[PDB]
Amino acid sequence: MKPHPWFFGKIPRAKAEEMLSKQRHDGAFLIRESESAPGDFSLSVKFGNDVQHFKVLRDGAGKYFLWVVKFNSLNELVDYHRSTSVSRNQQIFLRD
Secondary structure (H helix, E strand, O other): OOOOOOOOOOOOHHHHHHHHHHHOOOOEEEEEEOOOOOOOEEEEEEEOOEEEEEEEEEOOOOOEEOOOOOOOOHHHHHHHHHHOOOOOOOOOOOEO
């Protein structure tokens, strides 16, 4: 399983959150692949002055999902949740 060099590959959560706290861009996120679970990703979203970690999980189709809301790809659903908050209680967006 060749690791995905996309974004920052197997970046530590350490660096990903540090970078976000320098971006200061609410809604921003960093997507990264796990070494402990190759093929699966995490989504670390810069909301306010903190970062929250979402689990981005591969399904049996070879596709990716995160929420109970599911689109054709990770790329689509984060764009959906770019225009719309991920939650009615946690006002977080996923912005590029």
